[PDB]
Structures are given as C-alpha cells and as structure tokens.
Amino acid sequence: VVANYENASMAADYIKRVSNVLPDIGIICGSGLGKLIEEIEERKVIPYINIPNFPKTTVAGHVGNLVLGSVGGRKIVAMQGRLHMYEGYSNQEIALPIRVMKLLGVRVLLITNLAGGINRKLKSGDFVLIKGHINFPGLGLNNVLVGPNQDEFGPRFPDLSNAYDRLLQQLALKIAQENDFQDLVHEGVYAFNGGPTYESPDESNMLLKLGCDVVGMSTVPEVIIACHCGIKVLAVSLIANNSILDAENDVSINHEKVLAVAEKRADLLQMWFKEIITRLPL
Amino acid sequence: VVANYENASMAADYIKRVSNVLPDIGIICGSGLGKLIEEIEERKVIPYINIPNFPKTTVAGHVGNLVLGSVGGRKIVAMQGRLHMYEGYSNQEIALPIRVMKLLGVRVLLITNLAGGINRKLKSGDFVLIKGHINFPGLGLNNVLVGPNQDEFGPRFPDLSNAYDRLLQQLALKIAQENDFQDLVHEGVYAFNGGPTYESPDESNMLLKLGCDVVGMSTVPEVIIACHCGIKVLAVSLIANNSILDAENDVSINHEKVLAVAEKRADLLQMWFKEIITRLPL
Amino acid sequence: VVANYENASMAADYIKRVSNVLPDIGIICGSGLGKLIEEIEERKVIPYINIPNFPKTTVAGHVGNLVLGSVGGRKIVAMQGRLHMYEGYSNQEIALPIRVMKLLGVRVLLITNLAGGINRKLKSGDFVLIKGHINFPGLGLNNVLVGPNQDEFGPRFPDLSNAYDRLLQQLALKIAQENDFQDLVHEGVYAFNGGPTYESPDESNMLLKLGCDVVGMSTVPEVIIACHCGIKVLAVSLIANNSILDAENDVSINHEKVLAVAEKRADLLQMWFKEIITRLPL
Ligand SMILES: O=C(O)[C@@H](O)c1cc(F)cc(F)c1
Ligand SMILES: O=C(O)[C@@H](O)c1cc(F)cc(F)c1
Ligand SMILES: O=C(O)[C@@H](O)c1cc(F)cc(F)c1
Numbered sequence A, B, C: 001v002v003a004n005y006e007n008a009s010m011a012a013d014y015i016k017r018v019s020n021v022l023p024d025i026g027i028i029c030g031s032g033l034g035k036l037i038e039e040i041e042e043r044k045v046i047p048y049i050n051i052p053n054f055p056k057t058t059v060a061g062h063v064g065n066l067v068l069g070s071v072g073g074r075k076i077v078a079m080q081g082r083l084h085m086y087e088g089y090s091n092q093e094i095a096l097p098i099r100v101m102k103l104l105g106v107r108v109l110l111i112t113n114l115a116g117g118i119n120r121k122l123k124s125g126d127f128v129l130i131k132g133h134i135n136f137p138g139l140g141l142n143n144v145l146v147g148p149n150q151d152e153f154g155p156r157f158p159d160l161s162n163a164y165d166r167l168l169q170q171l172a173l174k175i176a177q178e179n180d181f182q183d184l185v186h187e188g189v190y191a192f193n194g195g196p197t198y199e200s201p202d203e204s205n206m207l208l209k210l211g212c213d214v215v216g217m218s219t220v221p222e223v224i225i226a227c228h229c230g231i232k233v234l235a236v237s238l239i240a241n242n243s244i245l246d247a248e249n250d251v252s253i254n255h256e257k258v259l260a261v262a263e264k265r266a267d268l269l270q271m272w273f274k275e276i277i278t279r280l281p282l
Helices: A005-019 A091-104 A166-178 A201-209 A220-228 A243-249 A255-279 B005-019 B091-104 B166-178 B201-209 B220-228 B243-249 B255-279 C005-019 C091-104 C166-178 C201-209 C220-228 C243-249 C255-279
Strands: A025-028 A041-047 A065-071 A074-080 A108-117 A127-135 A185-192 A214-216 A232-242 B025-028 B041-047 B065-071 B074-080 B108-117 B127-135 B185-192 B214-216 B232-242 C025-028 C041-047 C065-071 C074-080 C108-117 C127-135 C185-192 C214-216 C232-242
Touching: A005 A041, A005 A065, A005 A091, A025 A255, A065 A255, A074 A091, A074 A255, A091 A220, A108 A220, A108 A243, A108 A255, A127 A166, A127 A220, A127 B201, A166 A185, A166 A232, A166 A255, A185 A232, A201 A243, A201 C127, A214 A232, A220 A232, A232 A243, A232 A255, B005 B041, B005 B065, B005 B091, B025 B255, B065 B255, B074 B091, B074 B255, B091 B220, B108 B220, B108 B243, B108 B255, B127 B166, B127 B220, B127 C201, B166 B185, B166 B232, B166 B255, B185 B232, B201 B243, B214 B232, B220 B232, B232 B243, B232 B255, C005 C041, C005 C065, C005 C091, C025 C255, C065 C255, C074 C091, C074 C255, C091 C220, C108 C220, C108 C243, C108 C255, C127 C166, C127 C220, C166 C185, C166 C232, C166 C255, C185 C232, C201 C243, C214 C232, C220 C232, C232 C243, C232 C255
Parallel strands: A025 A074, A025 A108, A108 A232, A127 A185, A185 A214, B025 B074, B025 B108, B108 B232, B127 B185, B185 B214, C025 C074, C025 C108, C108 C232, C127 C185, C185 C214
Antiparallel strands: A041 A065, A065 A074, A108 A214, A127 A232, B041 B065, B065 B074, B108 B214, B127 B232, C041 C065, C065 C074, C108 C214, C127 C232
16 A cells, blocks of 8 residues: 555544544654553544554554544644564555644654664663764665655655754753753764664674764654654654673673663653643644 | 566667667766757657556656667767656666667767765866765665676676776866866766665765765666676766755755756756767777 | 465475484585585485475576585585575575574584675685674665564564674684684674675775775675574685775776685685584584
8 A cells, every 4th residue: 555645545534533633743652662642631542453544563463553632731643553664564654654644734743762872972761862863774775755756745855954853852951951850861863773683783883983873773764754744853762772882891782671771761751751742832 | 577688679679660770879867957868860759658668657757758869970879767766666677778778789878967965175066977986775785786687788796896987087077178167077986875865964974974975866776787788887967065065054955956056057068968979989 | 485483394394304314503605615515424415496485596596405414423404505685585585594494403503605805904815704794784674684573583673792603713713723724814894785796996995994894795694594593603704805905906806706716715615614513512
C-alpha cells in the first residue's frame, strides 16, 4: 500500500468516525518510555489492525495502537508501538501513519528514543536535544523518501536545515531549568545507524571523528516525513551508555542494560513532556 | 526487465530501424541544462514508451525521449529526461539505456548535473570537472552493479581509477581558456548522496572532513555502467550553492534557487559542450 | 525462503541422513584459497542444489557444494563456493547456511578473504588477522539482520564487540611464529565495501582518514550471523595490493592480479589453517 493522499485519507476518515478528537500534537515514544500514553485523558484506543491501510505488524507482534485524547488541556494522538526500519518495514509503511497525523490536523510532533553516547561529555541517563543529524541510510540510497513523490504532502527535494525547531528546543531546556535538572540536558547531532546490531567499537570511533554526538536506530525517518509535510519536530535522546568509553575499556552493551536506564528516567521524562505539551505553541 | 545482451539488442534494433543515425557520442543533461538537445540537426525524437524494454516512467511523468542527430558534424544520441535512483528505479532500469548506447556504437559519454559546493573555493555559478567520486550507495550495498554480472558488457569486478578520462578534462579546460571563462572552472571529487533530501548541514560538514568537493544525487550510476562497458566519460557539475557557507550562516536551499542558477549558465554551457563535441577524439 | 528454525532444520536433517559427520568447525574460504577443502579426509560432497531450502545459485553458476569430513582429527563442514551480497542474494539466503551449521553443532567458524590494503604498513602477500570492522551496509539500512528476528537463533539487538575471538587470533599468530612467517602477519580493522566495483582512489583516501586498515566485499555478513547465534569467529584477509599506494602512483587493480597473489600464498595458507584446526579449542 502506497503512502499517498487517497490511502491516508481513508485511514483518517475511519479514525475521525471512531474518535471525535481532532489532535494538534502527535507523540512517538521510545521503548520503556511510553507511560504518558496510558495517562491520556478521555482516551480512545484504536488497534492498528483495525485502521484501513495501516501497515501489517503481526510478524513482529507486540503492541500496536493509535491512542487519542487530552494531555494538559491539549488534544493529542500517540503511536503506541512504533515501526522501525530494521524490522523490514518499507518506506511507504513508515510514512503512512505520519501522513495520517497530518490529515488529522497535527502541527507538532514530539519524539523520544534510546541512544548511545559518542561525545565524551555524555553519561548514562543524560538527555540530548537533537539539533541535526547524519543520515547514513539516506546518503546510501535508503532514504525514507526514495520512490515517487506524493506532491499533495510536500516537495520533491526537501531542505532539512530547520527540521529540528529551535523554539521547541528552547522551551524544553527552560522547563528543565525550572525543575533543576538542566545538568542532565545537552544538545547534539544524531547519527542514524540502520541497525539492528549496535554500532561496533570501531564504528563508534569513526562516528567521533565525523562529529556525531549520539547514535541510534530510529527517529530520522519520521523526522524527514514530518519535515516534508510541514510538521514541526522536537526529538530527545535518552543516553543508555557511552560507546566511546566502552570501546576503550572493552565493555559490552545489551538491551537489558538499555531498558534499566529507561526505567530510571521514565517518570522524569513523563513529567517533562507533560509540561512541554501544556506550554508549547502552534 | 534485466539489462542483459538480448534485451538491449531488441531496443537497439528498433532504434536503428527508425533512426538511420549511428551515433559515436552520447549526452545526458542536467535539469534546466537541455537546450542543446532541441538544437540537434536533422533530429529524430523517439519516446521512451515506444522503445522495446525501455523502463516505464509514467509514475514520475514529464518528458522522456531519445533524440538522435548531428552536432558540429558529429553523430550523437541524447537522453531527454533522465532517470534518477531517488525516484525508485532499479539497477536494471538505470543500466539498460547506457548499454543500448553501447550497442549503437557510442564511445564517449558527456554528462552534466546540478550540485552543491563543499570546497570553500566554490561559488554559485561555478563549474567543476569531476576527477573522481565517493559512492556512498556503493559502499552501502546499493551499487548500480549489484546483481548478476552481464559478461557480454564487462567484468565482474571493475576498476574505476580511470573512469573520468584525463584528456577530455584537458580539452574542456582548454576551450574555457579560449573563451576567457576559465575563472569559473575547477576540478574536484563528487560525493553521491542518494537523495532526494538535500544534504543536511551536519552531513555537509562531514563531507568537508572526508575530502569531498561537491555533492549531488545523480551521475555516479551512469559513470559506473559506462566504465564497465568501456565508454569514456566527461562529467561536469554546475554549482547551485555552497552548502558549507549556508550551514555557517543558517541559510536555506530549494529547487527554485537551483533552477535559477541553471537559467543563468544554460547558454554558456550549451556553447561549451557544442565545441567539446566538435573537437573531441574517439 | 526465510532463514528460520523450521527451514534450517529441514536442511540439517537431509545433511545428517547423507553424511554421518557431526562437525564442530566450519570453514568458508576465499577465491583461489580453497585447496584445503579438496584434502578433507573421508569426504562427503553435497551439492547445494540437492539440499532442502538452500539458496538457488544457478544464475551466477560455478561450484556450490557443502563438504563434510575430517582435518587433523577434527570434524568439519566447508562451504565450497560462497555466496556474496554483490551478486544480489538476500539477507535470508546468506544467513541460512550459517544457521544450518549451527544446528549441525558448529562452535567455531574460520573465514578467509582477499582484500585491499589501506594501512601503509601492508604489502601485497601480507595476512591480516581481523580484530574489528566498519560495516557501511549496516550503517546504511542493508545489515544482514534487517527483517524479523529469528528468536531461536539469537537476540533482536546483538553486541558485536567480541565478534572476533581474541584467543583464536593469539593461536593463529603463535603458529606463524613457530614456522617463522610472523613477519607477514598483522592485525587490523576491516571495512566492508558492498561492491562489486573496487574502492575508487578517493574512497581509499577516505578509508585511511576513518581508521580502516583493509577493505573488501565479503565476510562481515557471515561474521554477524555467526555472532548472533553464538559461534566464535577467526577471519583472515590476504592482501592483494595497497590501494593507497596505487592511488598516489595512478596504478590499476584487476581480478587477474588478485588471483595471482592468491596462487602465491595458497599453499602456506593451507598449511597454516590445517594447524589452526588441529589445535584450536571448543
Ligand atoms: O515559557 C514559555 O512557555 C514561553 O516563554 C516560551 C515558549 C517557547 F515556545 C519557547 C520558550 F523558550 C519559551
Ligand atoms: O585543442 C584540441 O582540439 C587538441 O589539441 C586537444 C584534444 C584533446 F582531446 C585534449 C586537449 F587538451 C587538446
Ligand atoms: O599453543 C596452543 O595450542 C595453546 O597454548 C594455545 C591455544 C589457544 F587457543 C591460543 C593460544 F595462544 C595458545
């Protein structure tokens, strides 16, 4: 199924007929970082499998719902169970849910992920406001926009120089200062490793040479689809480890260590994003 | 349809039966840079859609013709409307028209494109004679030759060290000096960004570190297919902008700015390539 | 055909019913470097085309057999004719033979390849023990594990930091010292160029900047599938040329020069790997 105007419109029509919520803000939350979704007010939970033209996710399994409702007085739509390109989803499958958000009225997209630290200032448990990226799949002919352009959503050749909204970064930092956790908050450049293997020790050393501050396996495809169709983005990485230190000390990483860091910062990230939602403009 | 000997032969047979021209030189022209094609003498215009085994291009639309005739007393064949890999065309679709040129008798291929400047000496409106490349899709398992080798055209493992003919670069520069525009002409290394998003500001900074002089979304696939089957190449980039300056000053790019630079240099590029065609050997 | 538990099990059942050998060690040998296979004791040769669910290889042609028997008193299984991703084989086709080795009992995988030298200490005819890698296809969304995870074999997010076993590297070097050819043996970082074009001169210069010691078109996909399912790896490159010197002197490479280097070192590599097999643990 192509992520075109007609197909996105059919999905949006279904959602509107079931939901009654017209959302202004969209959220996509990293693994272990989804507690905010279960606290959306006056919720409507819509399984992906019930929505016309949504991608099939039964091979991977696990949760996959669209959740609509209110947070801090604002109308929102959340993806509960996100689609990652290392699972084998196509460009068209990643793009369709973001384009449905656009047709529903979304103007701002908030994203979190788990990532590895490259910059030597980064510790496990730190947050990084993403200010730009290095897209190795895009340089290598696997950009999420490879294929025909869908003209109704955006231009053939997008400019990504303002993909990460500056004012939203400023608002996130201001709220951290108000609650005295600004010592955990950095800004940086995100490298997209297609995955699913963690970056090797020698790949980590290369990324340091190339000016990368953090590395992960998500987020950039969604940012590009959002920027193409005029949706503003705030993207925040939670740092699971410093891969450069681990390479120097011959120390291993694993998904269990990652999820324990997620549990340690989950409640603070929830509180932070609730206040960002309450206060952001447009 | 595979870009094999039998399929390329059927297309060449059709073209010969319609055209009567046996071309020695092939041309592929960048967007906004095609005025020379409309001035080919005693032309025959052949829509792609009429040629056996040519790739289907109706999803993208817009022009797609093969044009045969004479320029400066030489017999040529031009592609009017080129195929780019960011549109989703396969390896086999890109390669078949170049292999048809080979079977028709082409010995030299001349190529132009629009590109972004990385080297700090490059200004909007400058020309760059390409002397080598960095192929991010090829390093990343999306080389145009991935698949079975077509032995009738070339070897399994090509050497690209002389893909950009030195004497043709010398002839292009000599003609620029004769007409006193050599101050616009540079040489450099081309980075292939698969696209279709312009390189991000942080990707631009990385390319500077890695020794790239210009960046664009075309040309390298055609160069590799030509080199594989023994066709000599001259490739010239027209610089639309300096991406490193734009990153330092937080300035945007777009396809409209690119096309205005094309219009500013179109007539001079036309005159230059007409004289190159008239004078080149083999 | 997916490289899943059921499909790998059917292939293993066939092999066991024909072979009677339960191997502990697997070998994959580079082009021109396969003489050891023809000296396996009490051999059983099994054409790939006869084994349930093995990948189809008739488009490329040439040899494709699984060979089981004894070397130095150890039970082994060899791939005679390996599958390379530049031929167009999918992730699933590369992975299935390694997962069949796992089900047959393999605990150690020994690999050789031909490669280009980047580090200035490397000469034609030298050997490099691989200690880590830079996986350009993996960074670029063409990792061999992209797709659903096969949970019976390994985790969703593997750590590659110990993919190249340290003790096996130590054993290989010790045997070189015993036979007084340690002056030919180095260690280094391998860059995976998807291929099939040799790295361009300017790509070679980039790889030097990025800390790569050697570059080639194989090995990393097999290493990753082996590491995912808990098989220990030793990987050795035979250096055909120094690509950095060739770029400075404008000297060409070709498959014929590569194969002549293979012939020069074939008998010594055979003797070396026979002794490694005899002596390795686990
Ligand atoms: O604090 C507030 O809510 C405003 O003053 C504000 C809004 C914003 F989008 C960014 C800010 F840095 C600050
Ligand atoms: O000017 C001419 O036409 C020849 O002298 C010439 C031909 C060429 F291929 C390259 C040159 F630099 C010069
Ligand atoms: O020489 C032998 O066989 C053992 O002493 C040995 C075994 C090994 F796996 C690695 C070694 F460096 C040495």
